[PDB]
């Protein structure tokens, strides 16, 4: 069983793929908190552009909301909703400057 | 439309997920080469363990083979086969030491 070339290329080319982002990233100065789960499944731009002078980056986007447990150690905890950025379309633009 | 908590948790917990790895990583001193595509789609261990003292890591593995274009700049180029490591099962083991 061998993955054929065009099939590899098509599957690895810059496109939106289910990715698992840490929430500390997506939410900046929320260190008065710990999250459960600590990460979340977001669609996000991935793979390569078959080139060193090209990077894969978001052109279209869309917000999704998620039930997260916002623990605040030594005080308390509650389930709240928490929106994250989700990439809907990708494009191989030129490396930043 | 709101992702329910247990559904987020189940989807983001340490498990094998289609990931897009650079080939320079998986193949070390092959810098007498450039690859097309430059990356490949491998199943790989991802998401979190809902904890700072725990990391997600491979326990079962399995090799997949792929048709890759091995360019060798200024000499030539040919399609060859190239095996990569693929994670079949994941587990939240304790952070290294």
């Amino acid at each position: 069983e061998v993955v054929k070339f065009m099939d590899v290329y098509q599957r690895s080319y810059c496109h939106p793929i289910e990715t698992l982002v840490d929430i500390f990233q997506e939410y900046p100065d929320e260190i008065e908190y710990i999250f459960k789960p600590s990460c979340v499944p977001l669609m996000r731009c991935g793979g390569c552009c078959n080139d060193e002078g090209l990077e894969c980056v978001p052109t279209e986007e869309s917000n999704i909301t998620m039930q997260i447990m916002r623990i605040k150690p030594h005080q308390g905890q509650h389930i709240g909703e928490m929106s994250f950025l989700q990439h809907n379309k990708c494009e191989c633009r030129p490396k930043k400057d | 439309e709101v992702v329910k908590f247990m559904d987020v948790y189940q989807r983001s917990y340490c498990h094998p997920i289609e990931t897009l790895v650079d080939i320079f990583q998986e193949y070390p001193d092959e810098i007498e080469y450039i690859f097309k595509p430059s990356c490949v789609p491998l199943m790989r261990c991802g998401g979190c363990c809902n904890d700072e003292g725990l990391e997600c890591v491979p326990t079962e593995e399995s090799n997949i083979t792929m048709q890759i274009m091995r360019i060798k700049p200024h000499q030539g180029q040919h399609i060859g086969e190239m095996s990569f490591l693929q994670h079949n099962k994941c587990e939240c083991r304790p952070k290294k030491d």
Partner: antibody
Amino acid sequence: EVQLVESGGGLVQPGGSLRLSCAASGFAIYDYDIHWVRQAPGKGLEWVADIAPYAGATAYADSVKGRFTISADTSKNTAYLQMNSLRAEDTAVYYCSRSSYAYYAAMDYWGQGTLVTVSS
Amino acid sequence: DIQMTQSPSSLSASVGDRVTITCRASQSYAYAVAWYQQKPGKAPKLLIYDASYLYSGVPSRFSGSGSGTDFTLTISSLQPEDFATYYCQQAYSSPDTFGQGTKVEIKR
């Protein structure tokens, strides 16, 4: 202020059933993990069951599963331990608790407790 | 049972003594040790968690060590109201865990 208030303990012929109740107040049981922990006369602590509504996730101590079913009703902010098929060694002071990630899995509010006693 | 081995099972100590109950955990890392104080015919009251931290309103005379698997509740200046059964609990993966207990009493 938080408090847990249990009720429903009493006397039951062996092989019968009771319904213990754990009324909470001053916090959502939804957001936390609610436990039942019992104590036979003069002996120590034995965890029996627990519910975490947010996760939809329950659990049962080996000696008790099949017969007891823990449950919650978050509109009434009350948890419940329906016990069937009751035995002499089940006889105890049933305590209900609150566990959280905030206090690193520790059980920080317990109710006063009811006494279940299983005799003929 | 995710074991926990509490010792001593019971003890005496005159007022003001340095009393120290200890506990011995299962085979995992896992720092989720709590300590409770149970006065007779009464609900357990939480004292210390994650092994060192100290629930609100708990007196300064209680502390705890998280040192490998060897944990220690420690009452610097034992008091006439500290008579009770103290239970430890390793609670990281599950609650099926509770020390056997320690009836502390005053000597006088």
